[PDB]
Structure formats: C-alpha cells, structure tokens
C-alpha cells in the first residue's frame with residue numbers, strides 16, 4: 001500500500017498534477033502487450049474513452065524505491081514533442097504500486113516493426129524513422145535531459161507511424177532482457193553495446209553519449225533490426241572500441257549516412273555532432289531520396 005505521507009510531500013505535489021482516479025481507468029490484466037523488469041504492460045482505457053497502455057510497477061515492492069522512481073521520472077509531464085512519448089497520468093490505488101498510463105502505440109516498438117518481413121520497409125522509410133528520432137532527441141537535449149538507453153527497441157510507433165522516443169522517465173524499464181549485461185564496472189544490467197566508450201570507462205552518461213547510441217540506432221534501422229556486434233562478447237566491447245573498431249557499413253546504407261554514424265562514434269565526445277546538427281544532416285540526406 002502506497003501512502004502519500006510516505007511519499008515526500010515534495011513528490012506529492014508533482015504527482016498530484018497527473019493522478020488518475022481508479023474509476024477513470026479500466027485495465028485488462030488478461031491482456032499483456034509488453035513485458036518489462038518492473039512489471040508488465042496491459043491494455044487499458046481511460047475516461048470520453050481513450051485507449052491506452054498501462055505500465056505496472058508492482059515488481060518494485062519497496063516504497064522508497066517506488067518513491068525514487070517517481071521522483072526521477074515525473075519531469076516527464078513537463079515535456080511535449082510529437083517525437084517524444086507523453087505521460088497520460090498516474091493511478092494510485094488501494095493495494096500495490098502505482099500504475100503509469102501512457103498513450104497506446106498501435107505499431108509497437110520500432111525494432112520489431114522493421115524486422116517484420118511483410119512490412120519490408122524501404123531505405124527511405126527507415127531513414128525517415130531515423131530523422132524522427134533525431135528530432136525527438138533534439139528536443140530532449142534542449143531540456144538537458146539525458147536518455148541513457150536510446151535504441152530501436154526503445155522507440156515506439158503510433159497509429160500515424162509517428163516515432164516516439166520512449167523508455168524514459170516513468171516508462172523506463174528493460175523491455176528486452178537479452179541486451180542488458182552485468183559485465184561492466186557498475187555490476188548492474190546495462191545496454192553495453194549501445195554505450196559510448198567513455199560511458200563504459202567512467203560510467204558517466206551525457207547527451208554526447210546519447211549521440212553515440214543514436215548512431216547505433218541508425219545502424220539498426222539500416223540493417224532492419226540486426227543485433228549490433230553479434231561477434232563481440234560483452235566481455236570485449238570496451239577494448240574492441242578502444243582498438244578503433246566500429247560497426248560496419250550496412251549493405252543498404254547510403255555512404256553519406258554511414259559517415260554520420262562514424263561521427264557519432266568519435267572517441268572524443270566533443271567531436272561528435274549535436275542532435276540539432278544531426279537533424280540537418282539527415283534531413284538533407286532524406287531529401288536526396
């Protein structure tokens with residue numbers, strides 16, 4: 001049972017903005033539409049009816065850890081961009097951890113979308129999806145918000161095929177455990193194959209290490225969702241990157257686009273482009289298609 005007296009009254013006042021009454025929300029616990037480490041995602045509907053995705057946090061059973069997760073993710077309510085996933089609200093209730101309510105994404109996550117063989121997205125489709133991610137990440141960087149887990153699996157597609165940068169703030173979790181590894185300095189599960197080299201070394205995350213991840217994500221798009229470095233063990237990813245080695249050019253990636261990737265992986269964080277700069281580069285490349 002989550003007691004709001006246990007919640008920092010500081011937290012109560014930010015949460016209050018977005019709370020959803022339990023009678024305003026219907027959840028179908030028999031309809032799992034996603035699986036994370038903190039809980040499952042269910043089909044819900046929010047009241048004037050709205051189809052939505054209900055993220056459970058019930059795996060987080062400690063009130064203090066629940067309170068810290070809310071504290072860190074609540075700023076989410078303050079963001080608004082067509083390429084960034086929005087928060088519909090938070091449903092506190094009678095027993096168990098809070099439910100987080102997000103818009104329903106009709107086409108699921110981006111990686112599964114492009115791996116689907118009937119979809120068979122063209123090079124131009126894929127580059128366009130990449131442009132959309134660049135714009136959402138441009139917005140988040142302007143807010144000084146570091147994502148720390150950008151990857152194709154962590155972006156969603158709505159009914160209009162608009163890409164939403166997702167898996168951040170209150171929607172943060174690990175939604176595919178295969179790509180998180182404890183073989184890093186922290187000892188905790190991390191997406192080591194999407195991480196900038198200095199992140200693996202110093203354990204720090206910046207907008208510049210997001211740029212690095214965006215490069216890997218571009219690579220994923222052009223390979224239609226192939227796993228990065230299938231041949232590099234999680235034990236070797238750091239030294240591999242130290243030796244100057246990088247993901248290879250995808251068969252159907254335009255030479256100009258590969259150049260952008262290499263840039264995102266420059267060893268000197270300050271030498272890598274900004275997202276504002278990436279939106280320009282990639283737009284011009286898309287336009288020449």
Ligand SMILES: C[C@@H](c1ccc2ncccc2c1)c1nnc2ccc(-c3cnn(C)c3)nn12
Nearest residue numbers: 033034041053055104105109154166167171175
């Ligand atoms: C709140 C949850 C969510 C949101 C909307 C959904 N709409 C429809 C269906 C499921 C949904 C799940 C969410 N928020 N950010 C993210 C980022 C990635 C993923 C994910 C799930 N599986 N895989 C392979 C990736 N989920 N995710």
